[PDB]
Amino acid sequence: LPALKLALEYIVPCMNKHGICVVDDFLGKETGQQIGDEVRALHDTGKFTDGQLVSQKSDSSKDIRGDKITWIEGKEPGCETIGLLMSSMDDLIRHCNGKLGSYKINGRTKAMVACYPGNGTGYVRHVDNRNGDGRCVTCIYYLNKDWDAKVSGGILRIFPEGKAQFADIEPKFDRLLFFWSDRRNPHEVQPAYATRYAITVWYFDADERARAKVKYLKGVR
Ligand SMILES: O=C(O)CNC(=O)c1nc(Cl)c2ccccc2c1O
Ligand SMILES: [Mn+2]
């Protein structure tokens, strides 16, 4: 399905109406599986961090750690299908530009690959960009085949501002998610009891990022 058709007929209207947009079967099984293989290779060769310190015990041997991460630019050896994913995300956003609210996206982060190791850890309720750091859209790609939250947990729960309900999103294989990064979409990852992988990039709004430089000071003489 052409990126422009997905953007104009689905991403743009859904984002402007709901601020949370799900696309299933984004790249297809072959490509999705190759991305999965690259992420697992990164994990198995020790490229992830040890995990977020969740419970700090008097005995450090009993510390509980949670989500592990690694930052991926997309050109590294063994990460080229991740890079292809990133380029595909960028193509979509490019075909949306000037139509995602009044934002003008002119950049993004590297990819943050996250692994919840399956030990009952999740991620506390938070806002991605709470203080105007420039990020306007969060984009997440999930890689977990036959994920069933009833058995493995790991639901992403979003609490859209001003609505007495939440939106639960299963981290399903080959699913792509967009949502506004700011305080409109507080969200959490519920405890995961199986290995759970996701790939995140954040897109920058030009004006917000330009003035973020001012309040987050870069020096000349
Ligand atoms: O994985 C998901 O479905 C949702 N994940 C997150 O919202 C999420 N957000 C942030 Cl800001 C971080 C930040 C650091 C590490 C992992 C994160 C994470 O999984
Ligand atoms: Mn988040």
Numbering used by the authors: 188 to 404, 408 to 411
Provide passages from the article that reported this PDB entry.
Analysis of a PHD2.N-oxalyl glycine (NOG).CODD complex structure led us to propose that certain erythrocytosis-associated PHD2 variants (P317R and R371H) would have altered substrate selectivities. Indeed, recombinant P317R PHD2 retains full CODD activity compared with wt PHD2, but strikingly does not hydroxylate NODD, suggesting its phenotype could be associated with loss of NODD hydroxylation. Structures of the P317R, R371H and R396T variants with a clinically used inhibitor628 reveal similar overall folds to wt PHD2, that is, a modified double-stranded-β-helix (DSBH) core (β-strands I–VIII), supporting 2OG and His-X-Asp…His-mediated Fe(II) binding. The structures suggested that these variants probably manifest altered substrate binding, but do not explain how their differing NODD/CODD selectivities arise. Comparison of the structures rationalizes the selectivities of the clinically observed P317R, R371H and R396T variants. Pro317PHD2 (βII-III loop) forms part of a hydrophobic patch binding the ODD LXXLAP-310-helix. The P317R structure reveals Arg317PHD2 present in two conformations, one predicted to interact differently with the LXXLAP motif. The lack of reactivity of P317R PHD2 with NODD supports a relatively more important role for Pro317PHD2 in binding the LXXLAP residues in NODD than CODD. P317R (which does not hydroxylate NODD, 2b) differs in that both inhibitors displace CODD to <10%, which is also less than for wt (with FG4592).
